[PDB]
């Protein structure tokens, strides 16, 4: 899942996207803005991170760090041994917070509603498998 | 036979600097990998033209090197395409390369254009086709001319 | 040593002098220009690609194979293997030629005076990008 | 003040520009494995305390490198943002108090050894605004430690 | 220790540059005999130091020329200050100068401060006390560093 | 002669092509650049500042000091008892270090090019110019 | 001293300058360092007013008092009772600060170096003598 | 948040238009007497506790008014600058502490006489960002009273 | 009177008002102008250089007299032989003109009114010390 | 025209190039001296009638220096507006027709000699637009002498 061609669209079109974005703050707060009306059960699942004002440090914070994950699993997707390590550490620290199937489909569905409105071109499948890899691989 | 227009070669130079990686060799590597696996999946007997680069293993430093070899001659090629003067000098010079090798005949490259129109849309965002194949052919039957 | 620090800084620069496709001529230029005023002997070499006209559609296909070439090498100076198979094949395509040794040397000091020009000064490195390159004409020479 | 807004712009800037469109994406591994090198040259920090024992041809160092080069791209981004950054720092310096034999001279280091790389591939770099932000960012990572 | 920022490092730039004789030595020389006249009143012990720049006379040629030398060197370190790499070596050939003369002391350093303190207000218009103050202490540490 | 019209001239050109900080280090580069293609061994006598990288920042602080030192004496072209104690001192500088006595009409040429290619050919003055940088020189060589 | 027609044009200079200036606390630090650079020995005059720092937030706080104050009394110049009253206040407040003549004389010259940087048209005697008029007030 | 940038903004601007160049420097009093007449009303705090006993035909309380608009417009106009802002408020919150008699309830009533005159003379005013940055000024004088 | 500090805030303040200054005419009648209206009495003195009409050829021409030799004398204020033979040059001019203490003062004013509103810095004292040193030499 | 619009435009922005930023204030005395020592080859007029019989050594001739390129410099700046330039000419034309020894052809070599010094510090110079306008000048100057 995620071949070596669809890892260069998205490859390319994460830089369009998250990698041209003035305002890294506000793109990735829009990602969980986007997840939360999604689904709105999501949302308590970050209390530990200031959700209540999601405009907080706290919160801006955690935004931030998700992103930079994001960015550095998609800059991995090419080096299968290092993005499955760092993929398991994502799932080590995802694994006590009791997430099912619906949490990370409604992610993807979130990054998948970010990404596009930053762009140009954007090819849906390619995204799909990719997230497909990254959500399976911190999902277990 | 459509003519590859200015237009053309806009779209195409435009669609191939977008997917370029400018500083390292493996997505260039990646992009030939699967041209030659559908040229080699089209035309099963084309394989043994590239023995002398290590076909059989297309993951090994041999192939791989050839790989930059192709999409960096093509990559020179496009470049070219608003100076067609300059452009004719390089297809001669590519068609003398090919000539040299035994068995490489016009067919082969009508089996290129196929693989290159199959995978340029798994790699080029907001890809234009019909571009790309007139512009691929002005490009092809530079190369092929003599054989 | 071209060490992995060096290959950063060379990959990077040489991406901003040959990144974009126009004016790949303006940086060929700058090395043929100064190459054939600080050894004009080595002008007969290209004699098969009309050197006496830098300008004339055969050595301007010729100085963008040039470009390419040394953008094949620097792509892959983080993968030796490939290198090493880039740099087999330009020796093959330079031997029996009648190029002299201090040819090489030559083009190092004209390539890397064209890439400052073009990146300006100020970011340049000369060990970087002496090291990377003395890397790439010692396979190619000979 | 240390690392004003002019300051961090500037670090933020020089960040980028090794990180460029042609650089992002592919060099990371090379800076962060650089960036280690040199910290455990300066540090004296035994290389086994780290994922694949600091071993570059290993994939778990190889990935605990993509982290704390993502982590350190995290925190200089937001140095224009301090509340945001403070957070950010206050996060790490949780996780790093969770590992036995994180020390603060130890969290210096490695921030020079961010500094020391970046000059390194940047020779033009603002070597002044970049010890100013990375000891800002140590003094938050390295809290209490 | 409070940091030459980038904001700083413009302001003294700024505040330098407007007060600047481009052409003519006249003015940098009544610049500095104000900060030696004052670093002498402050440490007597201090004018021994020089000596060998006929610091007993200072509207001589002698010490004229010193004070040319001292405005030019600050003058080359300030306009260095948005690259500080380059800075930091023209810092530590300036220390090694000093080193070389017996007896001058990091101590005289935060006497000479105090003197520019007091004179650049007199010659400098909208002078930024804090940011001079702040970096010229970037600058002056560099020279005293092993003294 | 170094008259006192020629020493207008070049303070006031020095002035336009030293005058603001940044682009000093393009003065200074145009400088040693001119300089050790003219006289390539020359290039040697500064190992201790890093000369065979121009651009290291070893170099840049002397090139920075050099171009300051010629900014001193242009400033006291009007006042001969100062710049004459200027001279006594870079002769000092440069004393017992094997400089060849053709490095400094070489370092002449060098300055008054690069300085005119600063401010423009069309107000340049050649004679003032050398008349006066000749008077700097003889101070310091020996 | 400071006449009717005095107070005329400094009401209107003064609204022309401080009254239009659209950084305030700029144009008040502006003040105060004009007065340490005229008066290097008045600064230590400000160390409870985080004066080490003129960039504080403490001490921007006092500048914006100071100015405040000129203000409030180039505001009441025409209102002999009332000014009175209020720079008898002010002179309460200056009191524990043992300035002298010198102090009073620098920051006089503080005001006149800064308010016509900012005007196209300045009246140096009406603001001496409406100066003189504040600060005798002030100095008792 | 509560008094936000651009509540501060508009806060700053109302007042701006209060205050202009036909008003600013002849109206203050004024303001500043119907203030305290509604403060007096709502707060029930005795007159006599200020100079002049609260008396507008007195000179005291007239410069008193002065001195009550010009620390409201010293502080409103700091809004948008809040460390600075805080700063002013607790100079503030300091002189009223040294008063006997100054309740934080007093406080206010104090910021609310000033929210409901600026509406009276500017009909237009945004009552709320009036209400939310008059909050933030009564929080700082008013700490701990 | 005039250190050779002050001559440089001087210099320098003089150059970036009356040195930059795109109409000269302009600045020089408006120096006039505001010694007029400083001190009434002054303008009967120019009845010889067609004051009547401050916009005259014959006025202009005496205002840009008035400027150059402020700039002369600016120029030359490190250079104490010479600017003190050219101030008792001045002197020798103004003698027959009866004029008095409270005539120099006006001028001192006038010019401390014009040159600061042309520019971001002033430096109060230094221009009265350096008005002084001037008025000083050309009353005698 | 002789000295036209454009010919003073051109002269004055050559003066002002002359004496700019860096050089005004600065380089009058020696562009003045030497302008005298071109006059008096030129004129064959005698040093003795100068203040400090000419002698750039004393400070009666330095001041009468600075008095003449303030002279030229007003005249100069004023040649665009030709009522207010006729004026200062006037003026000048009295000083020196209280003067024993002035002749027309003497005022003629001094402004010429202003020409030649601006042309060798200044190599660039308009000579035809200095002869003209330098001429309109002497001819105001040396009116009836
Ligand atoms: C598939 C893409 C995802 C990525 C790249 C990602 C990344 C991250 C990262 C980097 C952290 C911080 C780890 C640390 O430093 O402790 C984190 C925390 C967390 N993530 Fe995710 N995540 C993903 C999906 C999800 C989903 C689908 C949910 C739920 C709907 C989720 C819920 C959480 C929670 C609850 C935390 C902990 C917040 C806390 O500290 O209280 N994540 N994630
Ligand atoms: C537009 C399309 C093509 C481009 C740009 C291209 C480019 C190149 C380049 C640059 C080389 C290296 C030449 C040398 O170093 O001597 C090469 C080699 C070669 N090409 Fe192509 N080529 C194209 C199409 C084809 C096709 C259609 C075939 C036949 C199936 C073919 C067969 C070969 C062979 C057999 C070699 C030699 C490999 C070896 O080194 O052993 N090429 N080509
Ligand atoms: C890093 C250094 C260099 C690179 C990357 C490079 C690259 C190339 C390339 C790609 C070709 C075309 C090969 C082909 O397709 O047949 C070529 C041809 C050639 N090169 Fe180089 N070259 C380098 C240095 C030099 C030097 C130093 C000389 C001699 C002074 C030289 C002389 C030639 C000649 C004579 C040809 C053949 C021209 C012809 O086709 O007649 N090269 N080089
Ligand atoms: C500027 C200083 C530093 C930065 C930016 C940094 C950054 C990071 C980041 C981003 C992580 C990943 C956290 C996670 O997701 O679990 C991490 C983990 C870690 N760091 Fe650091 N670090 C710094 C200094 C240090 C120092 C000085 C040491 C050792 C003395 C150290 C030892 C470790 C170890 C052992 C881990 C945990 C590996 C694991 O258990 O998965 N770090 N660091
Ligand atoms: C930032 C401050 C300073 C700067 C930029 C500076 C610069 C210079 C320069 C450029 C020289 C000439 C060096 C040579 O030709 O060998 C010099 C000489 C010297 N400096 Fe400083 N200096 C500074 C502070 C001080 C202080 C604080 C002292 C001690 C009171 C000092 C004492 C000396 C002495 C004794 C000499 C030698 C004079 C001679 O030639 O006989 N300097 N300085
Ligand atoms: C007008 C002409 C020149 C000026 C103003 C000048 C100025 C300077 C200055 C200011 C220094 C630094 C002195 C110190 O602080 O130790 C220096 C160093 C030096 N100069 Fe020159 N210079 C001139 C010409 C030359 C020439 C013609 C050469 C040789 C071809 C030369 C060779 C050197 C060397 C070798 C050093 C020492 C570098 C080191 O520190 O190792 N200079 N010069
Ligand atoms: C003549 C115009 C002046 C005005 C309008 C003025 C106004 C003020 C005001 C409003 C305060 C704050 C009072 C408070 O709330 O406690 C203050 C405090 C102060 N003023 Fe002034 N002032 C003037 C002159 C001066 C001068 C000439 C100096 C000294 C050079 C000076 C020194 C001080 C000091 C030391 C404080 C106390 C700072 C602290 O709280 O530590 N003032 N002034
Ligand atoms: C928004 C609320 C308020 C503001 C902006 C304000 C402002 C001020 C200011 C600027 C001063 C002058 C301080 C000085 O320079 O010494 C002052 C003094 C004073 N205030 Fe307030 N105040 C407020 C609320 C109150 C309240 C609620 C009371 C009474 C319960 C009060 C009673 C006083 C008194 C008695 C003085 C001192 C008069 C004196 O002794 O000179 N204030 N206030
Ligand atoms: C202190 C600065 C002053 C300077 C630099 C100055 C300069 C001059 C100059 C250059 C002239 C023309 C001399 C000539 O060519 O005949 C002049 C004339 C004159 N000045 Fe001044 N002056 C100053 C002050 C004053 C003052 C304070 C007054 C009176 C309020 C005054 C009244 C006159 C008068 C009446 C004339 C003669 C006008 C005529 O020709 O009828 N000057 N001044
Ligand atoms: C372009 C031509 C000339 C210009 C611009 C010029 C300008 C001046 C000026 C501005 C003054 C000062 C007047 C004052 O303030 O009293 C002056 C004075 C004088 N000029 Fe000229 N002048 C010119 C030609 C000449 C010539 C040709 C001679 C001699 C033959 C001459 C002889 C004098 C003398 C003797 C004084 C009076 C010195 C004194 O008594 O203080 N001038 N001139
Ligand atoms: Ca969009
Ligand atoms: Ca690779
Ligand atoms: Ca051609
Ligand atoms: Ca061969
Ligand atoms: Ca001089
Ligand atoms: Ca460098
Ligand atoms: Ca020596
Ligand atoms: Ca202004
Ligand atoms: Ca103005
Ligand atoms: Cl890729
Ligand atoms: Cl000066």
């Given at each position: 899942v995620c071949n070596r061609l669809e890892q260069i669209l998205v490859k390319t079109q994460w830089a369009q996207s998250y990698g041209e974005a003035e305002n890294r703050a506000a793109f990735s707060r829009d990602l969980f803005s986007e997840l939360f009306n999604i689904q709105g059960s999501s949302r308590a699942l970050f209390s530990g991170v200031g959700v209540d004002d999601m405009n907080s440090a706290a919160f801006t914070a955690h935004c931030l760090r998700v992103t930079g994950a994001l960015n550095r699993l998609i800059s991995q997707l090419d080096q299968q041994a290092t993005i499955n390590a760092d993929l398991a550490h994502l799932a080590g620290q995802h694994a006590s917070r009791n997430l099912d199937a619906s949490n990370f489909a409604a992610m993807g569905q979130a990054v998948m509603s970010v990404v596009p409105t930053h762009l140009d071109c954007f090819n849906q499948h390619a995204w799909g498998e990719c997230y497909e890899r990254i959500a399976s691989g911190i999902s277990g | 036979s459509s003519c590859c227009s200015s237009e053309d070669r806009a779209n195409v130079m435009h669609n191939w600097d977008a997917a370029?990686?400018?500083?390292?060799?493996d997505r260039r590597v990646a992009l030939a990998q699967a041209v030659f696996a559908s040229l080699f999946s089209r035309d099963?007997?084309?394989?043994?033209?590239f023995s002398g680069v290590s076909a059989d293993n297309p993951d090994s430093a041999d192939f791989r090197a050839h790989c930059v070899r192709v999409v960096n001659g093509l990559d020179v090629a496009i470049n070219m395409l608003n100076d067609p003067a300059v452009l004719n000098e390089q297809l001669a010079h590519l068609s003398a390369q090919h000539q040299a090798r035994a068995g490489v005949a016009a067919a082969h490259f009508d089996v290129m254009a196929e693989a290159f129109a199959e995978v340029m849309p798994q790699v080029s965002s907001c890809f234009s086709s019909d571009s790309w194949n007139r512009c691929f052919a002005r490009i092809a039957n530079g190369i092929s001319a003599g054989l | 040593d071209c060490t992995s620090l060096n290959r950063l800084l060379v990959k990077r620069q040489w991406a901003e002098a040959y990144?974009?496709?126009?004016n790949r001529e303006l940086l060929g230029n700058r090395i043929w220009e100064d190459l054939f005023a600080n050894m004009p002997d080595a002008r007969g070499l290209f004699s098969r690609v009309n050197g006496n006209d830098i300008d004339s559609s055969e050595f301007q296909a010729h100085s963008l194979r040039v470009l390419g070439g040394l953008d094949m090498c620097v792509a892959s100076l983080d993968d030796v293997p490939v290198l090493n198979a880039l740099l087999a094949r330009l020796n093959s395509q330079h031997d029996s030629r009648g190029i002299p040794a201090a040819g090489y040397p030559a083009f190092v000091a004209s390539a890397i005076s064209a890439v400052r020009a073009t990146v300006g000064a100020r970011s340049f490195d000369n060990d970087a990008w002496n090291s990377c390159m003395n890397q790439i004409v010692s396979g190619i020479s000979g | 003040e240390c690392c004003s807004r002019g300051d961090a712009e500037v670090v933020i800037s020089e960040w980028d520009q090794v990180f460029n469109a042609a650089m992002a994406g592919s060099s990371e591994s090379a800076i962060g494995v650089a960036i280690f090198d040199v910290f455990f040259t300066s540090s004296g920090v035994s290389p086994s305390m780290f994922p694949g024992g600091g071993?570059?041809?290993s994939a778990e160092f190889l990935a605990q490198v993509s982290r704390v080069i993502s982590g350190a791209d995290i925190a200089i981004n937001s140095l224009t943002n301090r509340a945001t950054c403070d957070s950010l720092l206050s996060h790490l310096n949780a996780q790093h108090k969770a590992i036995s034999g994180v020390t603060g001279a130890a969290v210096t280091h490695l921030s020079e050894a961010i500094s020391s790389v970046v000059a390194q591939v940047l020779?033009?770099?603002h070597i002044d605004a970049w010890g100013y932000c990375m000891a800002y960012i140590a003094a938050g990572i390295g809290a209490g430690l």
């Open positions: - | 370029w990686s400018a500083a390292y060799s099963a007997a084309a394989q043994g033209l | 990144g974009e496709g126009t | 071993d570059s041809s020779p033009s770099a």
